[PDB]
Amino acid sequence: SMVACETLKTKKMEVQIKKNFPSVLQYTMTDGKVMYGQSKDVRTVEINGTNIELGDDDVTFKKVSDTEATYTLKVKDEAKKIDAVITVQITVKANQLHLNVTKIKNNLSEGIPEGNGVEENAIQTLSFPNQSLVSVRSSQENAQFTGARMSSNTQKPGDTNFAVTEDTNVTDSDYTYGFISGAGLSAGLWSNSEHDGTYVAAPVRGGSQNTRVYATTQQTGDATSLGLASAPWYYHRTVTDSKGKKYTVAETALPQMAVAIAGDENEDGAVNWQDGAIAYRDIMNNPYKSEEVPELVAWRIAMNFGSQAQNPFLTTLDNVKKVALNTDGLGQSVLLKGYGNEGHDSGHPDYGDIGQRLGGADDMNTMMEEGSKYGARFGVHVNASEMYPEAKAFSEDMVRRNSAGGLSYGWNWLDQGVGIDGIYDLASGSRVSRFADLSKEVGDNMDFIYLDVWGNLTSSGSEDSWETRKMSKMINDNGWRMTTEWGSGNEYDSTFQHWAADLTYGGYTSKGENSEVMRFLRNHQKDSWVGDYPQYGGAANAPLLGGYNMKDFEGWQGRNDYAAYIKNLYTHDVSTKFIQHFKVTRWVNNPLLTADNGNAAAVSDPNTNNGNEQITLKDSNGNVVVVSRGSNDTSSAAYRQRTITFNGVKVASGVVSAGDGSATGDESYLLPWMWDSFTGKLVKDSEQKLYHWNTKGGTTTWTLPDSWKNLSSVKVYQLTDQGKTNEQTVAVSGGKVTLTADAETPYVVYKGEAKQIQVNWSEGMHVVDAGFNGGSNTLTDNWTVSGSGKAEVEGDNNAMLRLTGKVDVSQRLTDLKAGQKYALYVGVDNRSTGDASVTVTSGGKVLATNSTGKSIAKNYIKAYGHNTNSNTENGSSYFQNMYVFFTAPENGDATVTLSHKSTDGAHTYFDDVRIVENQYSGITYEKDGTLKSLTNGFENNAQGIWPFVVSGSEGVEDNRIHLSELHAPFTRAGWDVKKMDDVLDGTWSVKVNGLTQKGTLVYQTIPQNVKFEAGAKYKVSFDYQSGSDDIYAIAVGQGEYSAGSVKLTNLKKALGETGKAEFELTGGVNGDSWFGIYSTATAPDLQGSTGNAQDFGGYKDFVLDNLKIERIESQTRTKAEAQDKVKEIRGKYDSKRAELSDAAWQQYQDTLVKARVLINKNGATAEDFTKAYDILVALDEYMKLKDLDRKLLEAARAGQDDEVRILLANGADVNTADETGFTPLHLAAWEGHLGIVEVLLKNGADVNANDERGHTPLHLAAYTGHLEIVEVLLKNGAGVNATDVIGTAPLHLAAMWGHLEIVEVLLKNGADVNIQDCFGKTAFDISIDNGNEDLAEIL
């Protein structure tokens, strides 16, 4: 007969379900234990925020089998435009129940119109308000609720734990995770809901706020019932872009929810959320490829920036092999930041554009295929929030616009970033097509995607969980694992968070996930937690499960310390990863959870670890890991003490070295590494190993694992960048082993003799060991050394080749395409006066050769391995790439030789031999090996801004100089507020972005790139665009750049119209002549532009293209003419010995001696006599200007208003500085010559000019007591709050004497009284110390 309910049953449970609605009455387990569903007649369906209560005629039921039932719900509301038919299936399997919405029929629409058009009357949201799928009563024994919300704050737990009492009153209380326990059963609710709600702490959106569980209380007899329901689901959601265009986008997935009923799953004698959590893992969503996370021991970033190609793909593969040797083959995860376009923050959002200067898609695939053999996973950094005009994806529709209709501007660095319209990008199918472009290039070789900045709201004011879910789906659909930037971001699909794994970022409030519930469930699936960083406290003070601590050695934020990188892996990452090979089963006595933070019912046990924190983890093979805290009191030394046991045997003990690098610990471990570096399956008994580490060093005794108990000895190896070294046989006595270790030195333990990991250095690079990673042995096995001098592999960080004396280092070139053009470049730092060379030969015949003398330019590339902060020698690095261009012979025989000619004793450093296919053919030579012509349109640059090299205007930086790319009309002058062209000719140019008012060199040529012969004449020309007048100048110097040894020619404005520059150059006596671009002290004309228009306008920029350097015919001279010119120059300046500086006399004497050597050499010719004469003319012109500058500094000091005007009208530089850095303005302000101060400033003297002590002319004027000069300086734009080297401002100097009216004019102009010097003294403290009570009276 007719019954109102049915029974669904499994071997583990029976469930009663209502026929009139998809509700459960109760779950009965085989043991007889019961869990309630929804005891009340609740038949509510919410659609588009409208509640519709269903009647008996609105629902039809069908029992499909003993494990499945189907419901058809008629959901109608004429007033609110709702007429739907919802199909719901209820399935049961084991102890799990699933409730899925399998079909949604809309009787008010024909679906979504083509192109994601607006579906009118669309079912946007759907829910079952107070569905109470699982419920607990106040009348039940130990009725509890446990919830988790998102917390990125180390001091604020994301958990809540409370007893369900009669006073419990909740209504749609939203949680990421929710668990109810009562009467011996526990259950959690899982939903695929994209709803965003209540959170504890998160600095961003981007799926941080995803709450999927709704808790509600109802009255059930005289008891209070707490029921769990799903949060609402999105179906056909209507969204709006930044232009006001509306779209309807289909569901990411159909609505799904589930429960899993647990008993005492961990057999600890109690039933709580932890039991429900073990069961929950069977129903919960698992991030795509989360199964490989325990294998990723070595995370790091390989960095590329600004056309430099600091880390080409094949170099990254070599670093993978170096890390594999040092970790004995542990798994790696390499994030390629700058894989595309010109590097990092270039070419966004063109995901398919693989950096051609890195080796393109071919070398990227070789790196990924070969790297996989070593357990290395690769992934790329992408941006879906900011774009650049150069990117082919850049269009008007892609542009995010504000309410006013203007551009939503991002950051300006290399170029101006513009915000992407995130809603358009999703709804138009644009982002998905760009990811498809990348998928076509990488195939199935790439492991992950790294999504930067998602959640910071630069793509739109939403970037919700619904948006993040669609984003994660298009990425996962391409076989890629999801990773993101922010600690809290993408809770549903992310396996890694940069601001979680890199603990140095953003402080204690913006870290990884601070939840015991979340980390209990997912610790083994993600690197999204809080690791050790004592500084942050709370969760960051010695977490028992550890947490990933990420370091880098390949240029990310200038990180290059390989030793520190490896030390870090062993300090924190090996144990964190070991722990991730097990799943949490029990977690008692958590000190972070208290009654005060809403965790009164938190899991406690005074019979477990003395009432202190303990975590029990288990694997699928019944292996047990137990992690214990020494003390639960933070003021106790034992709070940081941790014991790890593997199957009851101690494998780790002690305090870890502070994650913040502040204090070293004492922790030692002997960890069993049982898994392969691939799918993490168990290795064979032969291949089983243990990793040993002793922080302080010394001797420790350990019990070996059970399978090792009957061995008589073990094989112990020390791990290095060369692999396994210093083999030791260690005795095993009673299944115990004694190990002697050096402090912070890795060791690997085997049962027997272990084989060396096979490594073939520099695969695909046409040479073996291009980076010199093969040790001293590389110079015997791979490279061949010849000569009387020495060849050595030097450097304990990034190994280089170091040559001394007459020595040649050669190697045969393999896999070259016959007849094809190649560029071969190599990093070179020559400290010797003797030539350092690179030569390509084919059977004793030179194909191409290049050489350098002493290196004259320090390396300022932050992302580069050998920048001037890395110390190649004597606290500096002059590493710069030296090129040879050749055609591969039909013969097939080619060899590279790196050599040193001198017997100097001084060193030459070589590194990274790069042979690459390249079409550059712009260098022509004379009959003798010298330069005839060099042309460059920058269309075929293998790497960097060659023949130029980046200078030190920003120090060691991610330099705002790169090769700009054409994408018309967006890169052209006229688009938006853009007044300058990015490109002048062809597709590429050299762009300088906003490096104005630096008063120093921006970039320069170097003799290894373009050699100017001594006395020879050259015509240099180029096409340019400059934002304002005299903001950039052509600089011409000899040797290492020094301020006040360079010839400067200010470039006029060429904004939107290409200018042409041309000048003549005479090669200096030492052959070290160069030309470059100099940033003057002159302020740019912003033409009334405001905000971002100042940077996007191009007023502060410099673009250079179509460089032409050609040797020119000079007027021929006889020996007589040259000898007479010697006499002329000697007649002029021989007497001037005392007048000029000692550095100027040696420069004059050097040039004069070298010119006379050319003249008087036996068998000298007309060319030698012409060169000698031209050197003397350039010497004359130099000495003339030097004399005028010295005379200007003497006229400004002595008080000669007439002479100052005369000298300035003739040629004397207004910004000339003496030995201590005093400009004529400094000397005029000090001595008290108001007229001279006015004259110099009228001409264009630098008012903010610093001497060696950091004193500006205002400091000098304030100290002396020159009111008149103080006022005129401030009027011209002098820095009122300018501080010297001791941090002394002009206000302090005026207070020192009692210059009352100077203090008045300073304070009027905005002098800050709060300014403290290095000794913490204000102007107030300096006045009281000198006995000036009248000055102290003011403030």
């Binding site: 005093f1222 002590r1253 100290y1263």
Partner: peptide, 10 residues
């Protein structure tokens, strides 16, 4: 600490 082109201390 020196301040000027002469021999002035501060």
């Amino acid at each position: 600490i020196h301040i000027g082109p002469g021999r002035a201390f501060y």
